Every structure is written in C-alpha cells, then in structure tokens.
Amino acid sequence: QLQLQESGPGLVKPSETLSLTCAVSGGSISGYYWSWIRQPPGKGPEWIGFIDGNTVGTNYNPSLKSRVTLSKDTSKNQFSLKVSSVTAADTAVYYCARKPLRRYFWFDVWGPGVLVTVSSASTKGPSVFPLAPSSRSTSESTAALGCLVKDYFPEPVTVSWNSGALTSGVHTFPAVLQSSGLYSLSSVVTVPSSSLGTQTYICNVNHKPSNTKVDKRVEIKT
Amino acid sequence: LVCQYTIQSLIHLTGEDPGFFNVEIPEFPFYPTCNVCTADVNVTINFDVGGKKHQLDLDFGQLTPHTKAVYQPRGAFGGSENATNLFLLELLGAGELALTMRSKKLPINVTTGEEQQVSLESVDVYFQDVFGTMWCHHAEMQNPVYLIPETVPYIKWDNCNSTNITAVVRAQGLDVTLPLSLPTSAQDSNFSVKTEMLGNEIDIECIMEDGEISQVLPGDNKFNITCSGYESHVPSGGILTSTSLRLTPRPVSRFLGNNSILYVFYSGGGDYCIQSNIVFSDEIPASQDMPTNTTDITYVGDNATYSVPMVTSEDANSPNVTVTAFWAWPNNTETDFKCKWTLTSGTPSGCENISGAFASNRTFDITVSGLGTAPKTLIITRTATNATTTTHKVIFSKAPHHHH
Amino acid sequence: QSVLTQPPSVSGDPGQRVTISCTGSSSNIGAGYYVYWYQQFPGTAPKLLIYQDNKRPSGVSDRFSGSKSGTSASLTITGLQPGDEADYYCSAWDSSLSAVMFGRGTRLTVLGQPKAAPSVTLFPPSSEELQANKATLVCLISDFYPGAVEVAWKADGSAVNAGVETTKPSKQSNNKYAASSYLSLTSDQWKSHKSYSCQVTHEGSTVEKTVAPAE
Ligand SMILES: *[C@@H]1O[C@H](CO)[C@@H](O)[C@H](O)[C@H]1NC(C)=O
Ligand SMILES: *[C@@H]1O[C@H](CO)[C@@H](O)[C@H](O)[C@H]1NC(C)=O
Ligand SMILES: *[C@@H]1O[C@H](CO)[C@@H](O)[C@H](O)[C@H]1NC(C)=O
Ligand SMILES: *[C@@H]1O[C@H](CO)[C@@H](O)[C@H](O)[C@H]1NC(C)=O
Ligand SMILES: *[C@@H]1O[C@H](CO)[C@@H](O)[C@H](O)[C@H]1NC(C)=O
Ligand SMILES: *[C@@H]1O[C@H](CO)[C@@H](O)[C@H](O)[C@H]1NC(C)=O
Ligand SMILES: *[C@@H]1O[C@H](CO)[C@@H](O)[C@H](O)[C@H]1NC(C)=O
Ligand SMILES: *[C@@H]1O[C@H](CO)[C@@H](O)[C@H](O)[C@H]1NC(C)=O
Ligand SMILES: [Zn+2]
C-alpha cells in the first residue's frame, strides 16, 4: 500500500520557477527509483526524469535538461521537482511515480497528480452559493440541493458534502470556461424530502490556489 | 574425443547478468621464446532450447599471441542472425585466455519462436598447438542461465563530476585512481563507494563485500569489491587513502565499447558521484608466454642429459603422459616441433639428435646429445591427465672438466 | 514532443475483441526496446497495464495482452466490457532521443450500449446571490448514454443568447455522460421576465424545465 502524494502551487507566473514535492508513505525511497511525468490536458504523458533512491544519480529528458532539477530527501521520505523559466507549454498535471527497476523504464505506482497552470492572469477566490430546490416548493418526493462555485480562475477545485458522511447521490460536475476566463462549477446531491427538514446539509468547497475554504449551508427558502 | 588432455571448471553468476558472459581458461600452453608458435582454437557452446540439445560451433582460426590479442570467430555453425559479432576470445597474459559471450541476445540459429527462452549448459574450448596435441577445457554452468533477449536503454547520470583522469582497462582488468572530494573528516569515516560501468547495452555494478569500513586509516585501508557478472579468479578490489581512491573491477569487458563511462558513487545526508571515461587498451599487459622455470644443466662432453620429473605431483601413474621439447627461438614450424613423446609413442620421426624414454616412476630422461660449444636452451613441456602442464627452460652449458 | 503513432480512437462490439496499434521507428521500438501500456480513466493517474512487452501486473485482467513483433506494438482487449472505455497509451524508450516516449493515445468506445434519456435539473438563483445584484441559473444534465446534447435557454418562450455558458459532455462512472449549462444575469433581468426555461435536446427528443421569480 505504497502511496504517492504530490504537493505544490497551482498557479505560477511565466518565467518563474515551478516547484513541487512528492511524499511517499507506506514504502521507502531507498531501494527504488523515482520519476516525474507531466501530462497537459488533452495530450499524452511526457517524461521528465528520475532520481536514484540510493545515490545522487539523476537522469533528465534532454528536451528539458536545461530547466529541470530533481532532488530527494531520504529523511521525510520524499523527493522534489523544480522547473525554471516556465511558459504556457509547461501547464499540465504533474505526476510523481515510482520506477521500480533501473534497467527498464516503467512506472507501476503513480500519484493522483496536481494541476499547475502557468498564466499571467490572477487567481480568484470563488463565490459559493446554495442551490435550493424550487422542487422543495410543490412537495415533490425527492429533492435536489447543491452548491454553486462561481468565478475562479485556477482550475483545481474540490467539493464535498458533510465531509465523509455524505457520499451517496452526490454528483459534482466539471466546471465551465466562461468567456471572461473564469471558471464555474456546481455540485448537487439528490436527497429524499422526508429527511430534508430534519438532517443538516452543508457542502465543503476547497480552492487551494486562492487559499479559500468555505463550508456553505444549504436549506429551503420561504 | 579429439582431446588428449581435458580439465573442467565451474562457472556461476554472481548478482544479476551484466549483459555479457565471461569464462577464463588459464591452463592452455603458450610456449615461451617462440615467436612462431601458433594455435588452432575452436569453441563449442552447448545449450538446451526446450529441454532438447542444440550446439553452436565457432572457429577463431589461428592464434598469433606475439601480434594479436583480441579475436573474433571466423565462422559460426550452430548459427545465429549474427553469431560471430557476439563472441570474443581475449588473451590475458601468462598463458591465460578469456572467452566472452554477449548475453541478452540470441546466438542460436534455430528458434520455434515460441521458445524465446534459451539456457546455457556448458562450454567446450579446443586448443591445438604446434605439436598437434589437442587440449580441451570444459566449463560447466553451475545454474542453467535461461538467458532473455533484450535491448537495455543506455542512460547517463548527467549530474556527476567529470574527471580529467581516464580509466584504462587491460586484459579485462580496469585500473583507475581518483582524488577525494569528501567534506567529512577521515576520523568520521563511514565512507561507502559504489561503481557502475555503462555502455553499449551492458551495465556493471560493483559493491563492497563487507560494506562500509567506518574506519579510515592514514595508511591505506583496503576493501574487496564484488562486481555483477561472472567473477574472475583475479581478486577485484580497491583502496582509499587519506590525503585518493583506486579501483580494480575485474570483469570489465570490451563489449562496453569505446567512450563508455565509469560512475563512482561515494558517501560519508550528503552523497557524491564522480564519472570517468574508460578506454580499452589493445596491448597485452604482460608476456603471453606461460610461466617457465629455468634450470642449468652442465655437460663437459658433447652428450648431455636432463631428467623431466613427474608433472606438478598430480596423477602419478597416469593413463596419458606427453612430453615435448624444442629449441629456443625456432624459425620453421615444419621441422622444429617433432620432438614429442608419449607412453605408447616410440621414437619420433623428425626429432634430430634428441632422445627420450620413460624410466620407471615416469622420470622422463632426455638425451640432448649432439650439441657443442654453444649455450643453447631446450624448452621441455610435460603433461598428464588431470595434471597441470609445466614447461622447463633447460640451458645446456659446456663445462671444462669433470669433478670441477 | 515526439510521439509514437496511435489511432485516436477504436470502436468495438461488447464481448468481442479489438486491437490498438502503437507504431514507432528503428530508434525506439524497432531497436527491440521494451513496450509498455498504460490505462487511464478520465481524471485519474495512468495505470500500468502491460509491462515488458507482454507481461501482466498482478491484478490486471487476463483479457488484456500485448505484442511487439516488427516496428510496431499492439494491445489486445478480449471479451470487451463497457468498463474498459478509457484512454490507452503506449510507451517505449528512444535511443535517438535519450528519453521515454509516449503515444498519442487511443479512446476506447463500446458499441451498442443501451441509450439513456437525460435527467435535467434547473436551479433558480439563490437569494444570497440575488442580494449581491447577481443571478445565475444552473441547468444540470446527467445520465445520458449518447454524449451529444443541445441546450437552449428561454425567457418567456424567447431564445436568449447572452451570458450562456455550457460545458462539453463528460463521462461519468456509469459510462453515461454529464453536462451543465449556466445563464448569468443581473437581479433586474431575473425579475423582469415572468419565467425562464432550460431546454435539453437529446436524440431528437427534448426536455424542458422552467422556474419563475414569483415562487
Ligand atoms: C588419452 O589420449 C587419447 C589420444 O591418444 C585421447 O583420445 C584421450 O581422450 C586421452 N585421455 C585419456 C583417456 O587418458
Ligand atoms: C576447427 O573446426 C574446423 C572446421 O571443422 C576444423 O577444420 C579445424 O581442424 C578445427 N580445429 C580445432 C581446434 O579442432
Ligand atoms: C540451424 O543449425 C542447425 C545445425 O546446428 C541446422 O541443422 C539447422 O537446419 C539450421 N537451421 C537454420 C535456422 O538455418
Ligand atoms: C578479501 O578476500 C580475501 C581472499 O581473496 C580474504 O582473505 C579477505 O579477508 C577479504 N577481505 C578483505 C577486505 O581483504
Ligand atoms: C561532486 O559531485 C557531488 C555529487 O554530485 C556534488 O555534491 C559536489 O558538489 C561535486 N563537487 C564538489 C564541488 O565538491
Ligand atoms: C616455476 O616458477 C614460478 C615462479 O613464480 C614458481 O612459483 C614455481 O614454483 C616454479 N615451479 C617450478 C617447476 O619450479
Ligand atoms: C625414479 O626416481 C628417482 C629419483 O627421482 C630417479 O633418479 C630415477 O631416475 C627414477 N626412475 C628410475 C626408476 O630410474
Ligand atoms: C579428471 O577430472 C574429471 C572431473 O570431472 C573427472 O571426471 C575425470 O574422471 C578425471 N580423470 C582423471 C584422469 O582423474
Ligand atoms: Zn675443477
């Protein structure tokens, strides 16, 4: 049950230096090799390079050797990545993956991946609003309530409902790219109306690039 | 078998396969003070393809130790898409030779194509000298290889520190000396070094047998090293000296090609790596002649006599015993190598003014009578079944009178 | 960004077998270097499918297999199931580039799955957003197997083309697609008209949902 967790900023200005860290738990850095793979949306994966888990040895993709540095910390059980002079071609999802064998180049265990966007535009915290059911008016049998996440520029947004307790009937939709350049997302969970007025329903929206994290209560308006 | 004297050896792989297979044959006779001696050497490699036998037959042709040190087979009969390029016969000096085969590639000609799998069972080396005696060596593989055909990627650790110093490797033995870029004091010690030789589809990894010393001595503190591959009889090791590090990894093979890199990773979280280019010298490190002891026999009269004792104390009362003799620095191969004797063989035809007979206890007595007024050297070689071969340098010098 | 040649998408009948071809050159795949296959569901990290040309990791189903003969590799899926709809990428090392190469990718689509009408839910602007002098309507469409949908917005039965933002369809966990539509107005625009409607057209048929500020 070795797991990899990437961390790092979601928005980086052009010409700055991108920096991420991959945390490895359930396993050891030593005895294996560790690599970074990036994948821009709509395109295939691109290999960056790997780092030896027992030496200083690094190997880089020659197309990126000039601007990429790989490092590891055997303590804290983690290895990092740095990209210099980032451009609009460098915005992608960045994956940290284990390279089990040195002779051969394959990656068995990957991390979930973190999206990094490179743009001169500003990040923007979202306005979250409650989607209350007009269907709650007219006493229809099951009701749909949700939260509207509106006007955020950096893509990564995460929404949950009552944290772990509510995981059934919740449908989180992909966001839109409004012509203004800002993104809007919605997340709705369908619930029986019998338990509507007794159980409390709150959504948890997380927008890491803009440091916002808001828990919004959804209820019936009258 | 065509062989008149054979001895066997066991070869086992230590670590993972580095991409080549190495076997050393030390006992073949390389006659000294003979710039004209040659040898015919064929090699047969025995595999098993699906539990069924398959032989690959290779001929390296005629060996010329005085001029050429690296050989490739002239023809291949077991067959391969290209069998000859994957083999190498290299002289190591002092009568020793090494045969190298590139693993990770199929040298066998017949494949169902369902058996990518193939295992090496044994290797037979045939050695015919000027005297016409057939010497053989049988190299049994302790564990069947089961080799897999592959193309390993060639990577470069492009973060290490380049060194002006270059590593030279001669007769498969690499030798290099590097300075120390280590911040920690010698007393701290706990110094570990790991070496990797990459190039031309083969990688070699060497490590400490005993691990980190953890004790630095201003005086040299030596350390054995084990290298992935078929380890040579020659011990491989290194030494770090308080001030420099010298390394001698033994299985280094020419199949690495030119411009290959030796990476040296060392430590004592601070870690370091030094890379160095390696070059394969083409000159033999020392004389290819087998070691020969020199004895002085004095004759006050034209007749002279030397006694050839039993060989290397082994196989007393042997089934086969062969004794050869020839004059120092011969010029003609068609007449100078006729003086050969065996237990069954009688007086040789072309042997002139030399006589020999096997006395009880096999003390072969040679009557070299016929020479005079000239200090001449007779090269006598004796062998027996399962008995290492010895060669004697016998100098005959005239003596003025008897009883001195 | 040099790529290995893959078909953009392949189609297959359920329960049948389909082939995905990865084509390289003598520098990468023709040289005999190993071929690797990765499966990637949308929004998730790639999963190692086939390693070492034809070997199968513990867990991957036996319906998956690999081949490498020639200067092109191939991934085979047998007993095709709806859950196999994903992105398939091949990988091989290139000696002329000194790097690991990935393919263009292939979208696997199962033919002849049952159709599904879309479920449409339209939300009026929240009171909170209204007090900020803003009003956005949210139309949410889900559970429709044919991906393509047409969304139209009406206000008192009149087509509106201002502040309309709609997503492209996206695969759910059921292999059915989902989408959402947004109409952004001010408080005055929301109150001015008697009712607003979201029209979702799917496979000829359309579904309409309406809300009124009077409620
Ligand atoms: C002895 O010599 C013969 C040739 O005369 C050879 O065939 C045989 O292998 C040798 N070994 C034995 C049996 O001693
Ligand atoms: C090697 O093989 C060739 C071809 O069969 C043969 O003519 C030659 O005598 C052989 N020599 C040895 C070393 O047995
Ligand atoms: C391969 O070599 C064997 C002899 O070693 C021969 O009998 C066979 O016909 C050859 N087949 C091919 C692949 O030419
Ligand atoms: C190295 O190997 C030799 C035998 O060749 C052995 O006697 C010695 O103890 C080993 N250890 C070192 C580091 O010398
Ligand atoms: C030598 O290589 C090591 C590891 O790459 C590095 O830490 C060191 O800085 C290099 N040389 C110097 C300046 O000591
Ligand atoms: C031959 O000379 C070597 C030289 O190292 C010696 O070790 C060996 O004992 C000698 N043997 C004889 C036959 O005297
Ligand atoms: C037997 O051994 C002795 C002592 O080496 C030797 O002098 C003699 O020539 C040998 N052969 C015989 C029995 O003549
Ligand atoms: C020589 O050694 C080999 C080792 O396998 C053995 O099979 C053979 O019988 C031995 N022969 C003699 C002459 O001792
Ligand atoms: Zn005297």
CSV table of N, CA and C in Angstrom, one decimal, chain B residues 305-310 316-318 321 323 341-343 345 355-367 382:
chain,number,residue,atom,x,y,z
B,305,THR,N,72.3,-34.7,-20.5
B,305,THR,CA,71.1,-35.4,-20.2
B,305,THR,C,70.4,-34.6,-19.1
B,306,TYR,N,69.1,-34.5,-19.3
B,306,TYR,CA,68.2,-33.8,-18.3
B,306,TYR,C,67.1,-34.8,-17.9
B,307,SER,N,66.6,-34.7,-16.7
B,307,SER,CA,65.5,-35.6,-16.2
B,307,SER,C,64.3,-34.7,-16.0
B,308,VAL,N,63.2,-35.1,-16.6
B,308,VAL,CA,61.9,-34.4,-16.5
B,308,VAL,C,61.1,-35.1,-15.4
B,309,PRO,N,60.9,-34.5,-14.3
B,309,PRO,CA,60.2,-35.2,-13.2
B,309,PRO,C,58.7,-35.3,-13.5
B,310,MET,N,57.9,-36.0,-12.6
B,310,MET,CA,56.5,-36.1,-12.7
B,310,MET,C,55.9,-34.7,-12.6
B,316,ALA,N,50.0,-39.3,-10.6
B,316,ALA,CA,51.1,-40.3,-10.6
B,316,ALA,C,50.5,-41.6,-11.2
B,317,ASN,N,51.3,-42.3,-12.0
B,317,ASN,CA,50.9,-43.5,-12.8
B,317,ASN,C,49.6,-43.1,-13.7
B,318,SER,N,49.8,-42.0,-14.4
B,318,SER,CA,48.7,-41.5,-15.3
B,318,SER,C,48.4,-42.4,-16.5
B,321,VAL,N,50.6,-39.6,-20.7
B,321,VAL,CA,51.7,-38.7,-20.4
B,321,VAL,C,52.3,-38.2,-21.7
B,323,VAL,N,55.3,-35.5,-23.3
B,323,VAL,CA,56.5,-34.7,-23.1
B,323,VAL,C,56.9,-34.1,-24.5
B,341,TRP,N,56.8,-37.1,-27.2
B,341,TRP,CA,56.8,-38.4,-26.7
B,341,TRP,C,55.6,-38.7,-25.9
B,342,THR,N,55.1,-39.9,-25.9
B,342,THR,CA,54.0,-40.4,-25.1
B,342,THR,C,54.4,-41.8,-24.6
B,343,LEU,N,53.6,-42.3,-23.7
B,343,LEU,CA,53.8,-43.7,-23.2
B,343,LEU,C,53.7,-44.7,-24.3
B,345,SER,N,53.7,-43.9,-27.7
B,345,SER,CA,54.5,-43.4,-28.8
B,345,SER,C,56.0,-43.8,-28.6
B,355,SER,N,66.9,-37.7,-27.8
B,355,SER,CA,66.3,-39.0,-27.5
B,355,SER,C,65.7,-39.0,-26.1
B,356,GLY,N,64.6,-39.7,-25.9
B,356,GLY,CA,64.0,-39.7,-24.6
B,356,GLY,C,63.2,-41.0,-24.4
B,357,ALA,N,63.1,-41.4,-23.1
B,357,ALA,CA,62.4,-42.7,-22.7
B,357,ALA,C,61.9,-42.6,-21.3
B,358,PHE,N,60.8,-43.2,-21.1
B,358,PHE,CA,60.1,-43.1,-19.8
B,358,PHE,C,60.7,-44.2,-18.8
B,359,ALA,N,61.6,-43.8,-17.9
B,359,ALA,CA,62.1,-44.7,-16.9
B,359,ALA,C,61.0,-45.0,-15.9
B,360,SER,N,61.2,-46.1,-15.1
B,360,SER,CA,60.2,-46.4,-14.1
B,360,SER,C,60.0,-45.2,-13.2
B,361,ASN,N,58.7,-45.0,-12.7
B,361,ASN,CA,58.3,-43.8,-12.0
B,361,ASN,C,58.2,-42.6,-13.0
B,362,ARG,N,58.2,-42.9,-14.3
B,362,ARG,CA,57.9,-41.9,-15.3
B,362,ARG,C,58.9,-40.8,-15.3
B,363,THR,N,60.1,-41.0,-14.7
B,363,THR,CA,61.2,-40.0,-14.8
B,363,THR,C,61.6,-40.0,-16.3
B,364,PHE,N,61.1,-39.0,-17.1
B,364,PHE,CA,61.5,-39.0,-18.5
B,364,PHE,C,62.9,-38.4,-18.6
B,365,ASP,N,63.8,-39.2,-19.1
B,365,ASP,CA,65.2,-38.8,-19.3
B,365,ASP,C,65.4,-38.4,-20.8
B,366,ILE,N,65.9,-37.2,-21.0
B,366,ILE,CA,66.1,-36.7,-22.4
B,366,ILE,C,67.6,-36.7,-22.6
B,367,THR,N,68.1,-37.3,-23.7
B,367,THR,CA,69.5,-37.2,-24.1
B,367,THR,C,69.5,-36.2,-25.2
B,382,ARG,N,55.8,-30.9,-20.2
B,382,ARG,CA,55.3,-32.2,-19.8
B,382,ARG,C,53.9,-32.1,-19.3
